[PDB]
Design a protein around this ligand. Structure first.
Ligand SMILES: Cc1nc2cnc3[nH]ccc3c2n1C1CCNCC1
Length: 292
């Protein structure tokens, strides 16, 4: 067969040149690893973040198609895919951000990162989220560990494994498997009825903001703080207890050194009724007013 010219697709990453360095993070079905795409074989190739399945293909495939089509400075950049001649299997290739998530970066840089800079992170997170909301997506997994640091001045939403499209004319996505829910980040309606509204992402932003304000310290994490509030030994009764505490109107406490006007913005993310929650737009305005 007279075969045509072998054109280069910059988004096609060959498996044979994708060399593992270390693990970056892991769910239950997926893992991300730092790799070097090193076709010259001399360890000068580009570092990239590679997400694959643990030995759900259709899910990863939809995550790829979602990220590939998102274009925003506060959203991690798709770089491409890795596929094998055999087929079926696929890995997602993302830019690698050396500073990691807020979980790695914040505890190491307390001295550099003050309140104004935190509030700018908060604005950038809201802008990425708002951009996402406008494409009719609910993220469902917003948490400090899913916010990457591009530079001391810039963050990016850095994973989309649970992201779902909201149907046209509907206001929420109804979820089926919820076993692996980040319950300490989830709004009541997600916990009780398993429905996800954009306002549900707003709630999760509320807690992500808390983590940011406490610099992602483990003893101040939403999980640790909630378990302390309700009892850490209730096992299968934990979510119920959690739902009650929220129904009772309890919320995470104000972080030390968090000024009440920032805390009050946080509170509006946690109004019990979805409809009463501030929007990402309002949040952006509120934050911007504090930065003037
Ligand atoms: C911890 C971490 N560091 C990253 C650097 N670059 C990345 N690029 C894409 C992810 C990603 C990174 N991650 C996590 C983010 C949350 N999901 C697991 C990996």
């Amino acid at each position: 067969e007279k075969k045509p010219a072998t054109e280069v697709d910059p988004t096609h990453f060959e498996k044979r040149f994708l060399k593992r360095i270390r693990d970056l993070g892991e769910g239950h079905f997926g893992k991300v690893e730092l790799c070097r795409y090193d076709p010259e074989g001399d360890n000068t190739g580009e570092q990239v973040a590679v997400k694959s399945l643990k030995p759900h293909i259709a899910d990863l495939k939809k995550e790829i198609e979602i990220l590939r089509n998102l274009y925003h400075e506060n959203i991690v950049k798709y770089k491409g895919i890795c596929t094998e001649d055999g087929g079926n299997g696929i890995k997602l290739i993302m830019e690698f951000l050396p500073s990691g998530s807020l979980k790695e970066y914040l505890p190491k840089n307390k001295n550099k990162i003050n309140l104004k800079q935190q509030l700018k992170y908060a604005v950038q997170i809201c802008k990425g989220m708002d951009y996402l909301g406008s494409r009719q997506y609910v993220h469902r997994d917003l948490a400090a560990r899913n916010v990457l640091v591009e530079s001391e001045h810039q963050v990016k939403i850095g994973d989309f494994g649970l992201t779902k499209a909201i149907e046209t004319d509907k206001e929420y996505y109804t979820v089926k498997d919820d076993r692996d829910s980040p319950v300490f980040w989830y709004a009541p309606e997600c916990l009780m009825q398993s429905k996800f509204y954009i306002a549900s992402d707003v709630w999760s932003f509320g807690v992500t903001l808390h983590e940011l304000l406490t610099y992602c310290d483990s003893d101040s994490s939403p999980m640790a703080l909630f378990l302390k509030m309700i009892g850490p030994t209730h096992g299968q009764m934990t979510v119920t207890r959690l739902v009650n505490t929220l129904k009772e109107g309890k919320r995470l406490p104000c972080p030390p050194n968090c000024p009440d006007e920032v805390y009050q913005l946080m509170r509006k993310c946690w109004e019990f009724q979805p409809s009463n929650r501030t929007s990402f737009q309002n949040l952006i305005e509120g934050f911007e007013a504090l930065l003037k």
